[PDB]
Symmetry: D3
Subunit: 174 residues, 6 copies
């Protein structure tokens, strides 16, 4: 029972059409105190998209472009990196680091279930009270696989077999 994306995602999203102006998006984000908007798919075979406060500042504000005559579609990310609802939150954090994103839609097939962000991870995760320690756990599972092979090759009663599990023990200590 590791904490899953869907357990900590935000269910309430706001949307906007691609052809709306960046000014419409800004208006809508201020009004609703928001950092992101989902870009509404035009139809069922059209993927979700996303437009962030950073998208607006980096792509519009930074050049002094006119938000009233640029469209959402010009600055959105489509498609995006999507998170499956059962992906453990450790792995979502890792995904976000590997890809340099800070939010992702949580999608089941191609239905939007919500949004998951670095704030969601920070505030609702169990990473403070249960560090998963992913590399260290992976390293231990390997010491186990070696011990199964060493015990199968040299016998459970061999000092080698006893040692290979003492390698799992000594890692489990640190």
């Amino acid at each position: 029972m590791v904490l899953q994306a869907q357990e900590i995602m935000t269910q309430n999203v706001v949307t906007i059409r691609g052809s709306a102006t960046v000014a419409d998006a800004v208006k809508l984000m201020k009004e609703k105190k928001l950092r992101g908007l989902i870009v509404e798919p035009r139809h069922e075979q059209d993927p979700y998209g996303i437009v962030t406060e950073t998208d607006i500042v980096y792509k519009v504000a930074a050049f002094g472009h006119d938000p009233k005559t640029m469209r959402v579609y010009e600055i959105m990310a489509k498609p995006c990196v999507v998170v499956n609802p059962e992906l453990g939150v450790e792995y979502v954090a890792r995904l976000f680091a590997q890809t340099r994103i800070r939010r992702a839609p949580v999608i089941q097939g191609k239905t939007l279930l919500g949004i998951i962000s670095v704030s969601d991870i920070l505030f609702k995760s169990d990473f403070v009270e249960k560090p998963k320690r992913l590399f260290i756990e992976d390293e231990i599972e390997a010491a186990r696989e070696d011990a199964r092979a060493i015990c199968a090759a040299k016998g459970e009663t061999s000092p080698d077999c006893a040692a290979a599990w003492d390698v799992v023990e000594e890692l489990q200590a640190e």
Copy 2:
């Protein structure tokens, strides 16, 4: 009926455990003429992973590290960027560009259906014979939304309404 990821993905994958050696992976890739391996999840609440020929060359070969005593888990990407089976192939290409990847697992919920790569896109896509022209199509859909609003505000018979559709026409020409 736009071409979907699953229509062009490779169904046959080969797998390897995280605790196998990078030498085991290299052996297995040579033998089967392969560029990628799926890292087998240890259990049902453990995400898919992937280890590429480039991972091996950049992370092992480049330093002269010993492949016989490094493990797959040390060089794999886990989790990865996943592609939903219905995502149109244009959008997969775009995903791959935005994230700088060249293959992704195609996943339904958390079942692996296959793998999709830049070769799959190049060889099996319809991008030569049906360029989707995504920005240009998005730009046109906006000219349509403007025309609906201009016609609704000033009447279908107005020269403004006739012009706003002539804006859709003139874009459709180029």
Copy 3:
């Protein structure tokens, strides 16, 4: 009277010492609904620092490291990119884009006056109602410099001089 950084920065910051744990930081950010903390300088000849929600998720959460036994200093940025209080908000947006940051301290000499973020820019800027159009304005100022030289070389009454200002006019039209 272009809008200046200090006119839209947040004056209220919260701080934390470098030797506090990442758990102390997380606790403090949740409690106060915050995305950033200023790392308190140890003394007067020690620069400001900053630790963000993203720093915590990318550097701690993503590996399953234990926040109770890592320190702020291990994940903070020090020194940071600083914004002078009079820098126009267009240029702050641009700075943020060029350097891929989303907040910066606003500093006068080496006194902290506040913090300025992409949200501050989005919500409190005048970029919607007064696009500064920076490249286009720069392009026009050059057409002016050319016109001064062409008029000085060929006379104010020359058709060349009249044309070089008609070049400023025609750009001012688009």
Copy 4:
């Protein structure tokens, strides 16, 4: 008395206007054996800018563009990452690494005092004879904070208190 930016910056800068040609800049840099030029602000509420030899080679030379008909403003960085005059030179080096720059203006409020570059750091710093060892010093200051808390909780005479300072000692040894 840690060495400060202003103690090692170059006071003599050369400037150029944004509307000057890249050819004017090249001419001016050759003549004066220079690697950088400050782009002169048009007025008092206009930030400093900078155009480097690398800017010219990467953005002009690399495409075979004509330097006689491109302008400085097209290739300059504005605004830039600025260094405060009291920032210790260790931290300037770090700033430069974090942001991938090799020179920065040294600015007081919004007055230009000079320029500081990687050469200035290399040739005039005290980093050879006094390595500041920043992480190691930060790590030690934390061991101190722990010792103050452990001594305050368990008494100065406790073996715990004596140990926590022996932790500062043992780090100070390596």
Copy 5:
């Protein structure tokens, strides 16, 4: 006798002219099961170029651009990172990692001898059976240089001299 680039490069290349269409390139790559094409120099003082499957997917497919009316020259890399025929394969792997490429032409003066790729490295290298361990070897060579200086300053018979070689020994152990 360390394994050299030319010993493992692919001698058979296919070429295409810069003015051919991206569709011509795709046609040619499918037909010949290929991942790369060399762009034919127009003459003897024109450098080699290269167009990859990834170039096509990232730059053409990803936007839905029409391959029938874009040209190779628009998407190729020219010039490229070239590998000299005698460069050891460890160093080619490292080059590829430092520059984020996956293939390079092998060039002698300015004659093309072949192509070397991450697959060539993976399948034909000796990196599994003879890890070169480059940093560790470099570290050892330095311990040697120190020992020559310590022995020259204090005499071959000094315990210092015996120790400095015992430093080479102890590293050679791990």
Copy 6:
């Protein structure tokens, strides 16, 4: 007769061994007013390397590491991106931009002939007086290839053939 790398490279290099200290390198660079040093190959089957002022500042100074006890080999780039002596200087500029380097050794086979840097390009190139205009020239050569095919398919006397060369003419105008 396009200007070649070797015509503008610096013939005089200074070298240093990999096992020398970063302090030795700094000493040597100050003394000789230098920005780069070639790392001397240990033998004939060992590639050239390079250590820059930026390498020293970013990797040593920025952390306050002790230059007296770090070695050149720890901070150098080996192998490097090499420039062939006949590569036109436009293409060297482009190489440098594509790879984000600012100097490269000029190598013939595996003999070092010199070093070429962005300063060499800036000060000794002909890019001001003869912009090569590379994309525009490539675009024109394609219009030529089309005209040869259109004339061969429809006859030299056809208005199509006359037009396809008028396409070369009209591009040659702009």
